[PDB]
Amino acid sequence: NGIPVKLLNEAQGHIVSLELTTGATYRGKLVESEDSMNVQLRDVIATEPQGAVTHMDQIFVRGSQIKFIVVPDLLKNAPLFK
Amino acid sequence: RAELEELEEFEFKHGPMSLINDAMVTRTPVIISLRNNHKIIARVKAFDRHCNMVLENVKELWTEKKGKNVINRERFISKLFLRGDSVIVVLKTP
Amino acid sequence: MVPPINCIFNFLQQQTPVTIWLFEQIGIRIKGKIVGFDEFMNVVIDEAVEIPVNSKGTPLGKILLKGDNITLITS
Amino acid sequence: SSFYINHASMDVYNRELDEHTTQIDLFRIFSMSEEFKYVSVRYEEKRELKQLLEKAPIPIREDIDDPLAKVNVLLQSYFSQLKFEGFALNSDIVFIHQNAGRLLRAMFEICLKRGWGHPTRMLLNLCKSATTKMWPTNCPLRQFKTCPVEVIKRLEASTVPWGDYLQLETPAEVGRAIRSEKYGKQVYDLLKRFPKMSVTCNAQPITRSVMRFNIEIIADWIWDMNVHGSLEPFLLMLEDTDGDSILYYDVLFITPDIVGHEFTLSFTYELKQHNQNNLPPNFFLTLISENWWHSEFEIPVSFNGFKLP
Amino acid sequence: VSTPELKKYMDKKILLNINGSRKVAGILRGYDIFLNVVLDDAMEINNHQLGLQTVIRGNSIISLEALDA
Amino acid sequence: IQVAHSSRLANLIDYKLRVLTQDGRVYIGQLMAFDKHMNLVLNECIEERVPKIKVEKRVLGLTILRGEQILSTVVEDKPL
Amino acid sequence: PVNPKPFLKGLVNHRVGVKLKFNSTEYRGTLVSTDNYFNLQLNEAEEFVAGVSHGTLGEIFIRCNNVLYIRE
Amino acid sequence: HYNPKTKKLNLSAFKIVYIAPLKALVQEQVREFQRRLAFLGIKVAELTGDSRLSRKQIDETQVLVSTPEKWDITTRNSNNLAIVELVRLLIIDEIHLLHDDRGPVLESIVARTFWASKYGQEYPRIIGLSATLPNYEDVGRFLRVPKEGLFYFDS
Amino acid sequence: LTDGHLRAPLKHGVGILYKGMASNDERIVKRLYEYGAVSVLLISKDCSAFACKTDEVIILGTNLYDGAEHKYMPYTINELLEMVGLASGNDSMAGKVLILTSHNMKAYYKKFLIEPLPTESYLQYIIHDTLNNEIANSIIQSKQDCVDWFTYSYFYRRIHVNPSYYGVRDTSPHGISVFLSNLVETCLNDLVESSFIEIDDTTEIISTLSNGLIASHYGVSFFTIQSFVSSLSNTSTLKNMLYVLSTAVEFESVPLRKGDRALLVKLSKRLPLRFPEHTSSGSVSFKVFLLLQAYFSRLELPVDFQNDLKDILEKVVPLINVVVDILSANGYLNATTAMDLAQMLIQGVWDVDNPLRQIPHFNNKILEKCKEINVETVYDIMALEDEERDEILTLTDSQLAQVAAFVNNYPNVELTYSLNNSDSLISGVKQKITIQLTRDVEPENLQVTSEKYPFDKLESWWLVLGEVSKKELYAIKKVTLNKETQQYELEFDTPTSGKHNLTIWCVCDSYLDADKELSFEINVK
Amino acid sequence: FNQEGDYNFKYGIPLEFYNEMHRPVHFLQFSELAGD
Amino acid sequence: MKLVNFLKKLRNEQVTIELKNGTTVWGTLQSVSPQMNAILTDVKLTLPSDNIASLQYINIRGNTIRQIILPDSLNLDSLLVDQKQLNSLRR
RNA sequence: CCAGACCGUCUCCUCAUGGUCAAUCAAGACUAUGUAGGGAAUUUUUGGA
């Protein structure tokens, strides 16, 4: 199976930032991870390219339209590789 | 295993790919369109399931005109591999 | 709870009014009645009428709308 | 002409090769080849040589001071895959490597031409070894690129006839028999990718002197363009009851199209006078692979009550 | 194949942001693996109502904030 | 720029790669993981913008990239 | 009662009016045949660029991904 | 063979041979050749000879850098006489090898080139390179060289 | 300039010669040799029959590539003999022959050309067919008659002197006899597995069934018959039938040369049907399958393949007959398909494609002018007059004549039956039904006309009776309609009780689109 | 070797007492490098 | 069957692959997979010849490729019809 | 030295195929076979420029 998916799964309960097709950059906690990269967040800030920033309670994101998903520096070598 | 795709071998010649197949068989010029204001003219040689075609004597007509104007630039290409997503309409001319 | 596969069946049964939305242009939106049963989102819509909705009277015939280009269904 | 053999070398080959020349003698003959006239034993080479010639598999009629003996041992080393520290020896061995397979091949060809049976099979084997760098007693699983190291060692150390493995059918069984349940399937796959010929041959006399030989050559193995290559040359030798002299020979190419079909092969042979008069119990038809080790399938061409007209 | 966990979001009003600057809103009634969200409300943006229930396609639903957490 | 005659994605793992996206924003980052869709996990993502002249910079992410919108991955400079 | 693909089948050897997504051009002609992935093949094809025609083409073939709808 | 206007290289028409005595030397030369003739798009490979019937790899190649013995071997066999007709350029590096027992091979090769290829009969260009030595006239005679082709240069 | 490849070689004193040329060209070539103009002539192996009187015979390559065994088989000595073969015409008291050879085949040819050819039997191979045929004649009704037959043959008088060739170690009046008996038994016991013959104790009786008899009639081998049996079953398709036809031992003498497989593969793009998945590509069967379709659709074959096609056509008419009549024997209504196939073979056109292409020398340019007058069937061409015909066809005279001939001997036939008792219909009784056929014109001779089938054929018919939904044939008969109007009596077993919507056909074996039919109902008790 | 064990048999040419096939142990020993 | 099987065979040859966006890239093809993930050893570039920002090594994603021209002007076509038949040796 | 032009020297991923292991009341990681497929139309590689 895919290693990135595994990594994502491992990072359940971490502060993960995001970026979509339109460019809306988020930053909050990670609730759940799946085979198809479906992410749900808690206490999620919204800092869009348009400028009108907002602070949201929850948000669920469709996987296909994501550009990239951020993860912190802690899970770099272990325990997912070997 | 074998029959489940080998039956799909004759699906070209009946459905909408029939015309193109015919063209390929008896090479004739066809008008090929694209997404970003393109017009291409060439003759058919090889064919597959998903319109990933190979041609000869390929004339390209498009525009790099920062408006408002029209500039029909021209150049000869041969034996291309046009990925089948970009092809919209193809047709056999007499 | 209403699954979307049984939803199609329901639609087929009742024959309800619809206002279908498109991808490319926001203004022009279709109106009619869905008929067909299909494994894809491809469904046939008898008495289609493309109306320009605000960000008016433009008539149209009968459509089978493509599976990729259906933005909304209502019933 | 073909092999660029010097005239002197050719001459040497002519006399020193014989009808009854054996494995030990072949090496000697090779050593004698005039392309090793400029070779000589040295003092810094000597300890290594001494070490070798104790544990050498092919014995030495000559001794350490002679260069021929040294050459022979180098050849053996090469066959067995022995890279060296003392590179004088290694330099010598490089030369051998570049030209051994040549010379050996030439010798084999000569033998074939002559029509001698004791040398030709042994010579063929030698040639094969030269080509792929291993012994008969090292299993032919070594020449596969994909077969592992652990397995090969196990195979070597188990003390079993090679053909037995080939015969074995089930992958599980194969796995069990290797002392390694892992890779059994792989081994099985590669055993079907090793040549296996269900050969038959019916002889029949056309007249008194001439003898027709209807051969039925089936090929059970499955092809691979990586491992096998373009085609499979299989040198057919019809040889006498003893295996003393060759009657008739021919190189046949088994292509990818043949492997599995009931492929027939016909040929003719005129007999000797004495032979014609009183005839043997059976000749031996022998198909051997020029590349594949321990294929060497040989069968009895029957002559029980074959009364000539 | 793997079911998106939208059982958490059942019976809670959602403020969607679908593709192409369209902010639709509606309560969740049913879900699926394709993400064709069967929701029971649709009011466009200011605000005006254009029909009650709306079944949406999977491809054109990107961001969906839950109003009730 | 030093980058050898490398065969495949497996042989070029753990290298500093430029990555290019659909809209034209340029990235850089060390390629950590592999996948079916080339969802290449970058070790440190410095995204760059070019407006529709000159290239800008950012530093928000150390990311799991998604395959859909990637154009082509270019190698920058080997580690160690 | 009337499903999608049966409708399509019915509409063979009959007029069709096809629309595209990008470069929205009305294609008009008589239908020939279709496959399981919903590609099209028309006869006596006319390329109406928003009402006005570019030229009478004849026997043509259209890919499914660009197509929006199928009408009379 | 290759045209000045049309920049498509005529690959199948010409073939070239370079006879350098030592294998290391040959290897060295090959690299140099590659360096100085990469703009045209030429394959310069030393003779991976191996088998006689297998040697169609050489026919497809344009420039060859052979060792003398190897070259001889190549040219001696039956179904590799199609190469010698296509070989228009035969370069002999270090013709002073003649005095050593190897250079008999070179002589043999030369003889073959002249005498054997008579049914096609179109004699290739023969260029001898060598260290400065006397009896140059004799050498010229051997190689069918007039006062034009002979270039004696001292130390 | 036909073919153009003969020009450039022949222009510099070296002629070309191969099988299946335009006859005129061949004649010209011959003349050029005889006259003393062309010095050298290059000749193929198949044209050893064309004995051009030469002086110095060169024989280049004694190893012919054939795709049966996928290898270079050597020149059989007969061929060599035929080639030399040609005594010295110009130079008196002389004879020169160059034979270019292998070392392995030197002792083979150096002996058997200078010394006589030892003649031996190959009966031991083909005994199955021959024996079956004998049985069918009914001179053999036991396991001693066969022996007797053998004794009157070359096998038995060759096995005495050279017993070891055939596999006899005893070499005595008894042992040999025993061996013969064993052989006979073996031959029999492969026949009994199939539906050939039956043996029962009372010296002991032997007699044929339906399968053996047909084989005997058509001269087809045992193996082929067996193959046909194993594949052909109820509700089989036309493609399947074709495949079956292709798979036979009759096509061992159709040479697949070097670079033929590739050609075949290339061709396969431009054919209607495709080959089955679980057979071989390099074998002759595949070739046969390809080349049969290569003249149903009037394709542009190379002159190598023409010969092959001809060879195939030499063989097929029996085979196709067998195919049609094995299915009849078995009792299935896919016989119609077989019949159709046979018709196509006879002519060279498909059933659905076009009836108008059937007529000798028709092409797609003229077929537009034939469709102008709403001509669907071939019977509409019989009612036409000369003026319209002229307008239609603007070709040479011979072709026109041929067309006319075709029109004439192709009869407009009517289908009328007369049952014995429509009221008294009993189940499982041999109910005879007299069918009274008719022709438009009484034939002078029954000669079939076709361009793409060169060999001549006499016209026949097939009367049929079978239910369409079940696909179970009840009554069949082949007839040679030489009179204008006749009657024929199908003695058939009636079906089970209740209603049965029966349908008669009147399918011709040669001409397509002559499938006259007449459906009717009967209620059996 | 087994003094009362079953073996399959075949027609062929018999090898030398000290032929390579009978001496595999020696070969193995040789392979296990002598001059380390 | 497919024409990606045509590209599978061509190892170590040149192309100037026109992409969806529009760029000319002189490079060696190497092994072309069934998803068309081509791997170029050497690369030229033209960012949105014009303004050159060319690096050497690239691994292309198959979705981007519009027009591939040209390693070899050759026409060797089908492979799978050969293998399907010859493997049917014994039942 | 010796086989090579009538001829696929070389594969990134999922599934199945049989042998193994790491194991819990019926499920995952690895060599190998290509005999399977890759517009599973929407979570990616075949169309939102």
Distance CA D72, CA H134 (A): 44
Q: Look up residue D152 and give its two tokens.
A: 């090969």
I240: burial class by Cβ within 10 Å (0-12, 13-18, 19+)? middle
The tally of CA atoms less than 13 A away on the side-chain side of residue I294 is 25
Contact D247, D276 (CB under 8 A): no
CB contact under 8 A, B88 and G35: no
What structural domains and CATH numbers belong to chain E?
1-69 (2.30.30.100)
Q: Report the distance from CA of residue I411 to the C1' of nucleotide L8 in Å, as an integer.
A: 56
Q: Look up residue E44 and give its two tokens.
A: 């466009």
Q: Which of C9, C6, C16, C58 is nearest to C36 (CA)?
A: C9
Contact E14, E26 (CB under 8 A): yes
Distance CA J12, CA D300 (A): 7
**Domain range enclosing G58:** 1-72
Query: Taking CA F46 as the corner, what is the angle to CA F45 and CA F52, rounded to the nearest 5 degrees?
Result: 125
CB contact under 8 A, G7 and C65: no
Nucleotide nearest to A21 (CA to C1'): L48
Q: Which of C50, C12, C56, C51 is nearest to C34 (CA)?
A: C12
Edge-to-edge strand list for the sheet holding H125-128 = H44-46, H63-66, H15-19, H87-92, H125-128
Q: Which of H2, H31, H26 is nearest to H14 (CA)?
A: H2
As a dihedral over the C-alpha atoms of residue G53, residue G55, residue G61, residue G62, rounded to 10 degrees, the angle is -30
Q: Phi/psi at D4 (nearest 5 deg)?
A: 55, 45
Q: Give a three-class secondary structure readout of chain D.
A: CCCCCCHHHHHHHHHHCCCCCCHHHHHHHHHHCHHHCCCCCCCCCHHHHHHHHHHCCCCCCCCCCCHHHHHHHHHHHHHCCCCCCCHHHHHHHHHHHHHHHHHHHHHHHHHHHHCEHHHHHHHHHHHHHHHHCCCCCCCCCCCCCCCCHHHHHHHHHCCCCHHHHHHCCCHHHHHHHCCCCCCHHHHHHHHHCCCCCCCEEEEEECCCCEEEEEEEECCCCCCCCCCCCCCEEEEEEEECCCCCEEEEEEEEEECCCCCCCCEEEEEEEECCHHHHHCCCCEEEEEEEECCCCCCCEEEEEECCCCCCC
Among D1, D2, D4, beta carbon nearest to H69: D4
CB contact under 8 A, B89 and G27: yes
As a dihedral over the C-alpha atoms of residue I6, residue I8, residue I13, residue I18, rounded to 10 degrees, the angle is -20
Q: Structure solved using which method?
A: cryo-EM
The tally of CA atoms less than 13 A away on the side-chain side of residue J12 is 11
**Domain range enclosing K48:** 1-91
Distance CA D305, CA I175 (A): 13
Q: How far does A35 lie from chain E, in Å, by closest CA? A: 7
Distance CA D227, CA D190 (A): 10
Q: How far does D137 lie from chain H, in Å, by closest CA? A: 27
Distance CA A76, CA H147 (A): 77
Is some CB atom of chain I closer than 8 A to the CB atom of D263? yes
Q: Give a three-class secondary structure readout of I411-461.
A: CCCECCEEECCCCCCCCCCEEEEEECCECCCCCCCCECCCCCCCCCCECCE
CA dihedral for K58, K64, K70, K72, sign (positive or negative): positive
Chains that touch A (3 or more CB pairs under 8 A): E, F
L20 C1': nearest CA residue: D182
Distance CA E3, CA D298 (A): 65
Contact I29, I2 (CB under 8 A): no
H1: burial class by Cβ within 10 Å (0-12, 13-18, 19+)? exposed
Q: Look up residue G35 and give its two tokens.
A: 């496959």
CA dihedral for B40, B45, B46, B47, sign (positive or negative): positive
| Helix runs in chain K, H state only | 4-9, 80-86
* Beta carbons within 10 angstroms of residue I266's beta carbon: 11
Residue with tokens 């049952």: I419
Residue F68's contacts (CB-CB under 8 Å, 6 or more residues apart) are A64, F37
Q: Which of I462, I525, I464 is nearest to I495 (CA)?
A: I525
Edge-to-edge strand list for the sheet holding I430-435 = I417-419, I430-435, I488-493
Helices I222-231 and I123-137: angle between axes, nearest 10 degrees = 80
Name chain K contacts of F67, Cβ cutoff 8 Å.
Answer: 61
Fold of H1-155: Rossmann fold (3.40.50)
Render B54-83 in DSSP notation, one character per residue. Answer: EEEEEEEEEE---SS---EEEEEE-S--B-
Q: Which of I239, I312, I309, I315 is nearest to I267 (CA)?
A: I309
Distance CA D302, CA D286 (A): 13
Indicate the resolution in Å.
3.7
CATH code where residue C48 lies: 2.30.30.100
Distance CA D17, CA D29 (A): 7
* Amino acid making up residue I261: R
Distance CA B41, CA B62 (A): 11
Contact D132, D291 (CB under 8 A): yes
Taking phi first (over 0 means left), then psi (-120 to 50 degrees means alpha), and beta for anything else, what does residue C50 get?
A: beta
The tally of CA atoms less than 13 A away on the side-chain side of residue G26 is 12
Bridge partners of H18?
A: H65, H91
Is some CB atom of chain I closer than 8 A to the CB atom of B25? yes
Chains that touch I (3 or more CB pairs under 8 A): B, D, K
* Amino acid making up residue E15: L
Name chain D contacts of J26, Cβ cutoff 8 Å.
Answer: 55, 57
Contact D260, D305 (CB under 8 A): no
Chains that touch B (3 or more CB pairs under 8 A): G, I, K
* Beta carbons within 10 angstroms of residue D171's beta carbon: 16
CB contact under 8 A, K85 and I265: no
The tally of CA atoms less than 13 A away on the side-chain side of residue I235 is 5
* Beta carbons within 10 angstroms of residue C1's beta carbon: 10
CATH code where residue K56 lies: 2.30.30.100
CB contact under 8 A, I274 and B2: no
Distance CA H128, CA H115 (A): 18
Q: Look up residue I33 and give its two tokens.
A: 């040799």
Distance CA I510, CA I448 (A): 7
Measured between its terminal Cα atoms, the distance across chain H in Å is 37
Rg (CA), chain F: 12
Three-state DSSP class for residue I205: strand
What are the sequence ranges of the domains in chain H?
A: 1-155
Contact D3, D102 (CB under 8 A): yes
Bridge partners of E56?
A: C72
CATH code where residue G56 lies: 2.30.30.100
Instruction: Output the furthest CA–CA distance in chain F (Å, rounded).
Output: 37
Element (H, E) at I198: strand I197-200
Element (H, E) at K88: none
Measured CA to CA in angstroms, residue I515 lies from D178, I321, I336, I460, I507 at distances of: 70, 18, 10, 13, 5
Q: Which residues of D64-99 are buried (b: 16+ CB within 10 A; e: fewer)?
A: eeebbbbbbbbbbbbbbebebeeeebbebbeebeeb
Among E19, E36, E51, beta carbon nearest to C19: E51
Q: Look up residue K10 and give its two tokens.
A: 């061509």
Distance CA D67, CA C6 (A): 92
D1: burial class by Cβ within 10 Å (0-12, 13-18, 19+)? exposed
Q: Which of H99, H90, H92 is nearest to H130 (CA)?
A: H92
Nucleotide nearest to D192 (CA to C1'): L33
Q: Look up residue K12 and give its two tokens.
A: 């170590």
Three-state DSSP class for residue I33: helix
Q: Which of K53, K56, K30 is nearest to K42 (CA)?
A: K56
Residue I142's contacts (CB-CB under 8 Å, 6 or more residues apart) are I203, I204, I205, I206
Edge-to-edge strand list for the sheet holding B39-46 = B29-33, B39-46, B54-63, B72-77
Contacting C with CB below 8 Å, chain E residues are 18-20, 22, 29-30, 32, 34, 36, 38, 42, 50-57, 59-60
Q: Phi/psi at C60 (nearest 5 deg)?
A: -160, 165
What CATH number was assigned to the domain covering residues I121-208? 1.10.10.10
Chains that touch G (3 or more CB pairs under 8 A): B, C
Name chain I contacts of K88, Cβ cutoff 8 Å.
Answer: 277-280
Three-state DSSP class for residue H31: helix
> How many Å separate Cα F56 from the centre of its chain?
16
Q: Look up residue I452 and give its two tokens.
A: 């793409």
CB contact under 8 A, K4 and B83: no
Q: Report the distance from CA of residue C71 to the C1' of nucleotide L48 in Å, as an integer.
A: 13
Bridge partners of D285?
A: D238, D299
Bridge partners of I37?
A: none
- Whether C and G touch, i.e. at least 3 CB pairs below 8 A, reads as yes
Distance CA H89, CA H126 (A): 7
Distance CA K9, CA K30 (A): 9
Three-state DSSP class for residue K53: coil
Q: Look up residue F55 and give its two tokens.
A: 């290239």
In CATH terms, I411-525 corresponds, of 2.60.40.150, 3.50.50.60, 1.10.3210.10, 2.40.37.10, to 2.60.40.150
Among F32, F37, F66, beta carbon nearest to A68: F66
Measured CA to CA in angstroms, residue A43 lies from A30, A60, A77 at distances of: 10, 12, 28
Contact D283, D203 (CB under 8 A): yes
Compare all CA atoms of chain K with the CA of D259 and give the residue at the minimum distance: K89
Q: Phi/psi at D23 (nearest 5 deg)?
A: -50, -40
Nucleotide nearest to K5 (CA to C1'): L8
What structural domains and CATH numbers belong to chain D?
1-135 (1.10.3380.10), 136-193 (1.10.150.20), 194-309 (2.60.40.150)
For strands C28-34 and C43-52, give the pairing: antiparallel
Bridge partners of A61?
A: A39, E63
Q: Report the distance from CA of residue I243 to the C1' of nucleotide L34 in Å, as an integer.
A: 27
Q: How far does B48 lie from chain G, in Å, by closest CA? A: 14
**What is the count of structural domains for chain C?**
1
Q: Phi/psi at H79 (nearest 5 deg)?
A: -90, 30
CB contact under 8 A, J16 and D137: no
What are the sequence ranges of the domains in chain F?
A: 1-80
Q: Which of H77, H32, H39 is nearest to H59 (CA)?
A: H77
What structural domains and CATH numbers belong to chain A?
1-82 (2.30.30.100)
**Domain range enclosing C44:** 1-75
Contact A28, A44 (CB under 8 A): yes
Distance CA E32, CA E38 (A): 9
Q: Which of D297, D291, D160, D301 is nearest to D228 (CA)?
A: D291
Q: Look up residue A58 and give its two tokens.
A: 């929850």
Element (H, E) at A15: strand A15-20
Measured CA to CA in angstroms, residue C42 lies from C38, G4, G37 at distances of: 7, 7, 11
**What is the count of structural domains for chain G?**
1
Residue I203's contacts (CB-CB under 8 Å, 6 or more residues apart) are I142, I144
Among D80, D125, D242, beta carbon nearest to J30: D80
Q: Which of I78, I83, I92 is nearest to I122 (CA)?
A: I78
Q: Report the distance from CA of residue I500 to the C1' of nucleotide L5 in Å, as an integer.
A: 65
Please state which CATH class domain I352-410 belongs to.
Answer: mainly alpha
What CATH architecture applies to the domain I209-351?
Orthogonal Bundle (1.10)
Strand L nucleotides within 7 Å of a protein CB:
1-14, 18-21, 28-29, 31-39, 41-49
For strands G67-71 and B29-33, give the pairing: unpaired
Edge-to-edge strand list for the sheet holding A66-70 = C72-73, E54-56, E38-39, E25-30, E13-17, E63-66, A54-61, A39-47, A25-32, A15-20, A66-70, F63-65
Q: Which of G33, G40, G48 is nearest to G70 (CA)?
A: G40
CB contact under 8 A, K69 and B77: yes
I173: burial class by Cβ within 10 Å (0-12, 13-18, 19+)? exposed
Contact D265, D285 (CB under 8 A): no
Element (H, E) at H33: helix H23-36
Distance CA H65, CA H44 (A): 8
CB contact under 8 A, I274 and B10: yes
Distance CA D83, CA D69 (A): 19
